[PDB]
């Protein structure tokens, strides 16, 4: 009965769910801020942050894993050269969660997830 | 873990080959039979020149189970295949003399001292 379990299903099968956050993670590091549903955002943190943790330690193998996941060269271009460098001191918690309001379509709790830095 | 309709291999030179559990003795509506339990079985397969033939109903004591038994330390003894030793339904005494395999320490209940003494291992 979900005792001590973890990870939200989000009404999607594993394949779709995994591909979902993979696509979302890439779009996150591209604009540094995206508007999505609260539940979805709370689970996005468990994906992007581990990647940023892998960006702090540059190498050849990590870049392959950074490509293994997210499957995009544009992302690895932004990573290891922008984030990793400017997030060396930050000990975890690279993402901020801000609750915007409610979607006017289906009345879903919309939230603005952005990178803690976002200097501009 | 030997219930009804369970085929078992013989671990004695009684002439039998394969038997089948038709009723696990013990309590009322007892499900399984451990290693140290008695079960009424029938002979579904035997050898030509034997002291017992196919179609006989007699008691038999289990000796080897795939489920195995546990020890007071929590360790188990998993076997490979199910084996049993034939007895005399009325006297409960073993029929054959030779035992073709190892047994468990649990049979040391004095009621089956012959089985332990005739066992090659354990």
């Amino acid at each position: 009965m979900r005792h001590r379990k973890s990870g939200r299903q989000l009404n999607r099968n594993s394949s779709h769910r995994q591909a979902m956050f993979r696509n979302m993670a890439g779009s996150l590091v591209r604009h540094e801020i995206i508007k999505t549903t609260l539940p979805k955002a709370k689970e996005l943190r468990r994906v992007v942050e581990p990647l940023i943790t892998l960006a702090k330690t540059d190498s050849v193998a990590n870049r392959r894993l950074a490509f293994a996941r997210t499957r995009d060269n544009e992302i690895v271009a932004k990573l290891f050269n922008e984030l990793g460098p400017r997030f060396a001191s930050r000990a975890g918690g690279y993402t901020r969660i801000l609750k915007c309001g409610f979607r006017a379509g289906d009345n879903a709790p919309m939230a603005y997830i952005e990178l803690v830095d976002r200097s501009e | 873990m030997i219930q009804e309709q369970t085929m078992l291999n013989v671990a004695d030179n009684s002439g039998a080959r394969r038997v089948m559990c038709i009723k696990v003795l013990g309590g009322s509506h007892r499900r399984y039979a451990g290693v140290g339990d008695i079960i009424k079985i029938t002979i579904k397969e035997a050898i030509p020149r034997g002291k017992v033939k196919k179609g006989d109903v007699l008691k038999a004591v289990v000796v080897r189970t795939k489920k195995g038994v546990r020890r007071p330390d929590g360790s188990v003894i998993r076997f490979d295949g199910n084996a049993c030793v034939l007895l005399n339904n009325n006297s409960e005494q073993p029929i054959g003399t030779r035992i073709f395999g190892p047994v468990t320490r649990e049979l040391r209940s004095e009621k089956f001292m012959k089985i332990i003494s005739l066992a090659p291992e354990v």
Binding site: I33, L98, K99, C100, G101, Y112, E114 | -
Partner: protein, 56 residues
């Protein structure tokens, strides 16, 4: 399965007794903006606790 008799308007009203919506009472003005926004929610202009974090 269906109703054996027609439920009166009385039973109908009593059933909707716990269907009345609740209020909000969680209003709060921003420190800098002062706009009445929801508690724990950012303002319309993108403000929060005195910071236009959205710049929208």
């Amino acid at each position: 399965a269906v109703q054996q008799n027609k439920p009166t308007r009385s039973k109908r009203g009593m059933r909707r007794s716990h269907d009345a919506l609740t209020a909000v009472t969680s209003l709060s003005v921003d420190k800098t903006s002062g706009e009445k926004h929801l508690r724990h929610h950012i303002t319309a202009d993108g403000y929060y606790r005195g910071r236009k974090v959205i710049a929208k």
